[PDB]
């Protein structure tokens, strides 16, 4: 039944880029009040399969298109709510909404899209939010202001577990190269021009940004995980604008730049659009494969593109003005060819700390995987795919082995001290005695195991407070020590829960 | 396979009785050249079916209509290129293009509606044409200058005879 | 009626790096098996049938497992430093952080495994450019090594595509 | 098919050791360009097998014996090109040609002989090359300068991988 309602304020000139509104899913099921919200507070924890609905007059003039982004973990909140960029909200799951389909709807499987259960008396983790932006604005203004209604449907019933099934699983060997919720940016076509090239790199592993924001997200990041791959982009089309604008478009792909000959460029396998729907396009290039992440100074076009050609229009009737927008969603890779894995199953870095400006030193690692801060010495944080996937979740959980390696900065003969490792179940103040280890300075390697999680059951990405296993590292003649280096790899089964993005 | 190519330019004022252009079929093959156009050189003659496909952005809002006129002998062109009355434009075979129902496409069976073989190498008799003109006009301007690609798909083989089958 | 084989399945000598003029080197090795040059020390190359399988064919691409043995050249109770093998997926400058590892010098060995190869499969018997696997040598106290041998033993399946032959 | 040609020419004295020219596989077909060039531009990549055939007058009477070098990697061009000594032309995969036999033919399986894939807009690594040399000279000078045909047929269709099966 109808569980909790709330509405999007439309401006009667909705251009491309605006913020409408931020809906706060809880929110909108207690000030609603709800039949399904009095179950809930009896329930106590839920993981409701919604349907949402967002109710919306169907126009076929405007050519509007707006997205709903479904951001549990309150991640791309604070980026938006000025002017919401493409690169942001379509980071998250999330869904095209159609001016001139009119009506929307969607499931959302809590369990998997969020992962926690949620509690009737407060926001656990951070408080889910559904976001409204628009993609591609309006041809002209309409005549007035207008609204939108959000609608939340579930039957909700009491929650058996605290934690979804894993969205994903880590695992270094394994990208298969299907996709969810891959939507680029929308590509521009003025219709001032009577040809057109407008590229799409595929180097998917790159990370995309805003500004000097890089928007780290599951696709990129997954991407990532492999060297390069080759075989036939299968996706859709979305021609974005007002049923009186018209377009034809040669979509192929093309190495290293494009060729200048229309012959030529008319030889190569490629299809046409002339309206929405899905297209396979093989990705061309002398090695049959394109490589996932770029070099130094090197351009994503320099690599293998997907390039949309308009070859006739677009056109409109006068006076309009507005360009013609085509909005892409890649599906997966059909028929892959795929490199090696760019990481094997082995140990990865996660920080060294060097430059060391006391000998007493003590960094707490507690449950968590994370990034490091020191006033005392210098620390450098390892860029890899796991620490990527850890951002890129709302709640993680598993086991990480650990080595750890040193060199000396005094004479070997002079050394004295160690590498501690304290182990504790609670922590440094009432804690338990767990497999703390001293290391002689002189062994110049350890090795340890590091639970990430606690008694519910997983980390969010950011400082909590739960009850769990605790480790420190000790040094007590930390200035006799030129590098400590921390190499982790995961044990099978390291769990992520809720994807979602983490822009910085 | 697609075996030539050409482009139409459209004006933003489309007016009832403009000529839009002329595509010389042969011109097509040749300056595609084109995995067709090699075959052609090695049969020496052709008698092609082909399939002609203008590509054209549909738009219900716009009344314009075109005509396609396939003039294999040269017999118009001189008197259409100022102005195209639908009296010439319509007196070879031709074919009419709606802007609602966008990409066009016909068969020509160039043994019927032309009747001799093409020659590699040169013109045989007169150089085969396509000519665009508008038949009736936008109901007012557009936004811009557009333009419209013409294809040919064919499979040629060589041709068996000279001469095809005679129409009447 | 044949001999034993001249090479047993074991390690052999891929470099021997000696004489080291400055405290801070650092080799590149990236995702290559090559011949190294060094302006600040000396370089002498192993010659072994790997090695000319490699100079004797177009492409290769495989996995080779490397055993680092070096000697100190100051009194032992002074020495401090590393051999680290930095290892990365890209380059330098924007690549991700594999299982770097760092030997302190007193342990006197280390092993590793270094990629030939990249994203598009198989590496030139040239210099290249191809997104893959980095590999580096990094050395903090150079002067205190008097040898730094690298011995490897390819992982069965290494492959060589194209024979052709190798003038020096 | 007919894909690529290439003509070499021979002095009317052609002595052991001389060097008669390089044809360069992609400008053989490039140039000629080819329904299998226009093929190729389709296909992207390709694997071809080729068969090479060297026309050419037989004669028992002069003891003229040539080679032709395949040279996919592009490694003894620079050091043959005032003479070509055996060593290097034998180097790599070859053929001699007998004049007593007339009219040469192989075939080349690409994929074997050089491993990887034919990108139809450039090089990828280094350009393939045949080499042509005089292995055994004739016996006395004949009566004038000549020359010999070479031509690559095949059937080119788009490879599905980058890399061939390695040769070891």
């Known amino acids: 039944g109808l569980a909790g309602r709330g509405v999007i304020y439309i401006p009667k000139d909705c251009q491309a880029n605006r913020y409408l509104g931020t809906l706060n899913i809880r929110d909108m099921i207690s000030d609603f009040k709800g039949v399904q919200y009095e179950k809930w507070i009896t329930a106590g924890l839920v993981m409701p399969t919604f349907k949402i609905v967002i109710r919306l007059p169907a126009n076929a003039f405007t050519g509007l298109t707006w997205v709903m982004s479904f951001d549990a973990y309150n991640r791309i909140t604070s980026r938006i709510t000025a002017s919401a960029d493409p690169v942001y ?6 869904w095209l909404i159609h001016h001139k389909l009119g009506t929307f709807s969607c499931e959302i499987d809590y369990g998997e899209l969020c992962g926690h259960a949620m509690w009737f008396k407060s926001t656990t983790f951070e408080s889910p939010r559904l976001h409204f932006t628009c993609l591609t604005g309006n041809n002209k203004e309409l005549a007035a202001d207008w609204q939108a209604v959000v609608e939340l449907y579930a039957e ?15 695992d270094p060997g394994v990208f298969n190269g299907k996709f969810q919720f891959l939507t680029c940016p929308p590509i521009f076509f003025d219709l001032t021009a009577v040809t057109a090239l407008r590229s799409a790199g595929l180097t998917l592993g790159q990370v995309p940004m805003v500004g000097t924001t890089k928007v780290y997200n599951l696709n990129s990041t997954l991407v990532s995980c492999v060297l390069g791959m080759g075989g036939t982009v299968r996706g859709r089309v979305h021609i974005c604008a007002p049923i009186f604008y018209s377009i034809v478009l040669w979509v192929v ?37 394109t490589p996932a992440r770029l070099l130094a100074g090197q351009s994503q076009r320099d690599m293998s593109s997907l390039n ?27 028929r892959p060819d795929l490199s090696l894995p760019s990481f094997e199953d082995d140990y990865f870095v996660w920080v060294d700390f060097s ?3 006391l000998d007493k030193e003590e960094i707490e690692i507690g449950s968590r995987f994370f990034d490091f801060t020191s006033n005392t010495c210098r620390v450098s944080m390892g860029e890899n795919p796991f620490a990527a996937m850890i951002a890129c979740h709302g709640l993680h959980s598993g086991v990480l082995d650990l080595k750890l390696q040193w060199s000396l900065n005094t004479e070997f003969g002079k050394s004295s001290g160690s590498v501690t490792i304290t182990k504790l179940v609670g922590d440094k103040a009432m804690g338990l005695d767990g497999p703390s280890h001293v290391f002689a300075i002189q062994k110049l390697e350890g090795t340890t195991e590091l639970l990430v999680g606690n008694f519910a059951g997983a980390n969010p990405n950011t400082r909590f407070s739960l009850y769990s296993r605790w480790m420190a590292i000790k040094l007590d003649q930390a200035k006799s020590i030129k590098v400590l280096r921390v190499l982790c790899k995961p044990r099978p089964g390291f769990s992520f829960y809720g994807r979602t993005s983490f822009p910085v």
Request: aromatic fraction near 14%; charged fraction near 20%; charge should be negative.
């Open 355 to 357: 430059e060391f400006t």
């Open 253 to 289: 792909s093309e190495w290293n730049g494009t060729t200048m000959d229309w012959n030529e460029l008319f030889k190569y396998p490629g299809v046409y659009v002339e309206e929405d729907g899905s297209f396979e396009v093989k990705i061309r290039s002398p090695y049959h494969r």
């Open 89 to 94: 909200t379509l980071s998250v799951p999330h």
């Open 156 to 170: 909700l019933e009491e929650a058996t577990s605290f934690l979804g099934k894993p969205t994903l699983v880590f």
């Open 308 to 334: 949309f050609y308009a070859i006739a229009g677009p056109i409109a009737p006068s006076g309009e003005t507005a360009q013609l927008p085509i909005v892409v969603q890649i599906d997966e890779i059909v």
